[PDB]
Amino acid sequence: NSIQIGGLFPRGADQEYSAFRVGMVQFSTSEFRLTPHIDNLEVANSFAVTNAFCSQFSRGVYAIFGFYDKKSVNTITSFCGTLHVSFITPSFPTDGTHPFVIQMRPDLKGALLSLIEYYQWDKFAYLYDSDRGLSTLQAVLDSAAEKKWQVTAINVGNINNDKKDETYRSLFQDLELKKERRVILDCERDKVNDIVDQVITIGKHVKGYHYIIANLGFTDGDLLKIQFGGAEVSGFQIVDYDDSLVSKFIERWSTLEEKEYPGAHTATIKYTSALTYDAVQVMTEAFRNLRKQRIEISRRGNAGDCLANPAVPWGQGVEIERALKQVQVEGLSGNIKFDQNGKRINYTINIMELKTNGPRKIGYWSEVDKMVLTEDDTSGLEQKTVVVTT
Amino acid sequence: NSIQIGGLFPRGADQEYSAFRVGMVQFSTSEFRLTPHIDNLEVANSFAVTNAFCSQFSRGVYAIFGFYDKKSVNTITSFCGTLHVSFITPSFPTDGTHPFVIQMRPDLKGALLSLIEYYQWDKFAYLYDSDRGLSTLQAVLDSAAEKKWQVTAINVGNINNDKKDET
Amino acid sequence: YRSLFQDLELKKERRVILDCERDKVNDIVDQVITIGKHVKGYHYIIANLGFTDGDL
């Protein structure tokens, strides 16, 4: 039983495509086989997104999948909201509730809030890139109202690569006027690298400074460059490597030849690709749930124009979502659950700290339990509580 | 020499369309007269936007006119940039240098910062709707850094109208 | 290297004269970068004619 689905991907997202095919291999079943429709179009062109979308709609695919730009999110929400076509996504969570918008990336901001609550910062700089969405900034500012924080947010993503240099030295010099010791970066994997590099060159990775890297790729980042600077560094990890299923994933992940699956022949993996690999599992789990519900879904693949007026929804697709959010299985990120809005729920994220020996977990942020310190920290290994009689 | 053009007026903007009619009256000329393709569709719905857009595109209209949402801006920019079709809007300006884009609103930003400098303020709240975009926010914060300003921005616009009083 | 400069910390040295060939010069400099001991309050003296020849 072929089951056609979409397969949008940004170019240069090779690791995700590789892990995607890995998902196709790992979870293939005799009962039916998925029929991906790969499309390597840039997400920057919303029109091109429209093109691929109508294209797969012509394919009559029962599902569509891919990344999206903040520039593109409104388009996907508009169409999938209109045509009642379900759409899973690794990308950052939608700022607004929408139908047919499953989203693999857990909300991160609340954990960030609790994280600040732990360090009890009163004031700090806050760098950010626009591309993931400014909503996090809106959050930290709203908190800043209640928490009387004097945050100094600044965008950095406008800067050209060609002059990507002095702009930083000018920037951090500005931070010196406030003598900031505390900054939360909020940038892309690459921008994280360049920023850390410039911090190295200016030497502000010395003890007395501190940093917070607002993303799931904290372990993914190459932090070895600054491990010894004495400044403390901490971030987030959706994917524990100590997990059994994870280590098992690594056992084969390293093995794959790069020629077939480039970027895969490594000890680790980007969390995003991991979310992809999980997402395929979720999809296939849903379709497995369909036949058990014995619900026919054999819609015509000749959907015709997506621009057709009226754009009548095909109800079988509408049925699909009803199952999709109800799905629940383990993945590389661990357990996953969804709200009626398609946002992830009941997720828990592993707070991380870099240390001289290497990076280490210290606690986990539950959706309800918020920050929770581990058992390691709360002990007497290096130092414990002393009873003073007086 | 009648000349086909687009028409994309969001619902509930009657005064705008009326003004458009007055514009059609004041500048009508024998050399040519415009042929509007007026439409009343939700600005928020990028899908419907694309629908009417491609619809007029089927007309092959030599120009298009209408507004856009901050959500929809990427749509129309992506199209005029791709389709090399000219377009004009009275909506708030794009943050980027987008080809085949015309826009009637001069940026209020520099005048705003200037006005700030005139009062020589140091501390202020900054209430904002999301809808016109956060560019002014990025700007006022930018000037805030160098000027040692203490901004207190807040997103009032997400509040539900059902209880738009308690908040 | 890290063991080495840590030893310098016991004397809290702010002042060091390197005297090495340009390759090991560059390496030691890189390590100084990684350990971050190139902030204000430290100083260095590179004892060779290649002071411009090396990256700085």
Short mmCIF file of C-alpha atoms in Angstrom, two decimals, chain A residues 45-48 50 70-72 74-75 78-79 82-83 98 128 130 134 138 141-142 150 152-155 174 178 306-307 311, chain B residues 44-48 50-51 54 70-72 74-75 78-79 82-83 128 130 134 137-138 141 145-146 149-150 153-155 158:
data_model
loop_
_atom_site.label_atom_id
_atom_site.label_comp_id
_atom_site.label_asym_id
_atom_site.label_seq_id
_atom_site.Cartn_x
_atom_site.Cartn_y
_atom_site.Cartn_z
CA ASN A 45 10.93 32.32 -1.69
CA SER A 46 7.38 32.07 -0.43
CA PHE A 47 6.21 31.91 -4.02
CA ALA A 48 8.43 28.91 -4.58
CA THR A 50 3.54 27.99 -3.04
CA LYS A 70 9.23 33.10 9.56
CA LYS A 71 8.65 34.68 6.17
CA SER A 72 6.97 31.47 5.06
CA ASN A 74 2.04 32.51 7.32
CA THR A 75 1.85 30.96 3.89
CA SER A 78 -2.83 29.99 5.25
CA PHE A 79 -2.89 27.10 2.79
CA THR A 82 -7.46 26.47 4.02
CA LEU A 83 -7.05 23.14 2.26
CA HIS A 98 -3.59 26.82 13.73
CA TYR A 128 18.90 37.66 18.92
CA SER A 130 15.16 37.61 13.67
CA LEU A 134 11.00 37.52 17.96
CA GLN A 138 8.42 39.37 23.61
CA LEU A 141 10.34 41.48 27.93
CA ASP A 142 6.95 40.59 29.36
CA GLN A 150 16.70 45.92 32.46
CA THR A 152 19.32 45.14 26.50
CA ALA A 153 18.10 43.23 23.46
CA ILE A 154 19.90 43.62 20.12
CA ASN A 155 19.48 41.99 16.71
CA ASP A 174 28.80 49.12 23.59
CA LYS A 178 26.99 48.99 30.79
CA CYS A 306 -5.06 24.27 -5.21
CA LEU A 307 -6.15 27.74 -6.25
CA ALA A 311 -11.36 25.64 -2.46
CA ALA B 44 -4.77 37.90 6.74
CA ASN B 45 -5.53 34.94 4.48
CA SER B 46 -2.45 34.49 2.32
CA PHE B 47 -4.17 31.67 0.50
CA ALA B 48 -7.05 33.83 -0.69
CA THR B 50 -2.67 34.21 -3.75
CA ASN B 51 -5.99 33.16 -5.22
CA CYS B 54 -3.17 34.58 -9.63
CA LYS B 70 2.71 41.71 7.99
CA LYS B 71 1.84 38.08 7.47
CA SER B 72 1.05 38.64 3.82
CA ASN B 74 6.20 38.02 2.31
CA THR B 75 3.60 36.71 -0.09
CA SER B 78 7.75 36.86 -3.10
CA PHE B 79 5.42 37.19 -6.09
CA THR B 82 9.39 36.33 -8.76
CA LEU B 83 6.87 37.36 -11.38
CA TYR B 128 2.69 48.11 20.57
CA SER B 130 2.29 43.34 16.48
CA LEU B 134 8.32 45.19 15.17
CA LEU B 137 10.73 48.26 18.21
CA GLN B 138 14.06 47.11 16.84
CA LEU B 141 15.83 49.57 21.12
CA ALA B 145 21.38 51.03 23.59
CA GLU B 146 23.55 53.97 22.57
CA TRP B 149 17.49 54.57 27.37
CA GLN B 150 15.38 52.32 29.56
CA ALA B 153 8.01 47.68 25.51
CA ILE B 154 4.82 45.62 25.80
CA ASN B 155 2.74 43.67 23.27
CA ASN B 158 -2.42 39.97 21.46
#
